[PDB]
Nucleic acid binder design. Structure first.
Length: 95
DNA sequence: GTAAAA
C-alpha cells in the first residue's frame, strides 16, 4: 500500500544529482503550479511561464533547504516568475 | 532568489 515515497525524499535525490526524481516531482506539481500562474498570464503563454519556474527551481533546488516546505517554496517561485514575465511584455511597447 | 498555505 501507499507510494512509500514522499515529496521530501524526491527533493533530496535531485540535490544528490538524480534529476530523475525532479522529473517525477515536476510533472506532479506541474498541475498545481500552473493553476497558480494561469491567474497572472493567459493560457496561451502559461505553460512557458511554468517551465521557466521549474528551470529556476532546479538551479535553486541545490540551494533549497529540504527542512522547509517544498510546495510553498515552489509556488512562490512560479508567481514571482509570473510578475517578471508581465514586465518582459510590459516593456513590449516601449522604446 | 524566491521559504505560511495553494
Amino acid at each position: 500500500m501507499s507510494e512509500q515515497l514522499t515529496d521530501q525524499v524526491l527533493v533530496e535525490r535531485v540535490q544528490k544529482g538524480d534529476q530523475k526524481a525532479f522529473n517525477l516531482l515536476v510533472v506532479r506539481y506541474q498541475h498545481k503550479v500552473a493553476s497558480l500562474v494561469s491567474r497572472y498570464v493567459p493560457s496561451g503563454d502559461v505553460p512557458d511561464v511554468v517551465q521557466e519556474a521549474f528551470i529556476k527551481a532546479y538551479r535553486a533546488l541545490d540551494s533549497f533547504d529540504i527542512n522547509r516546505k517544498f510546495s510553498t517554496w515552489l509556488y512562490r517561485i512560479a508567481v514571482n516568475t509570473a510578475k517578471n514575465y508581465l514586465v518582459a511584455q510590459g516593456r513590449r511597447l516601449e522604446l
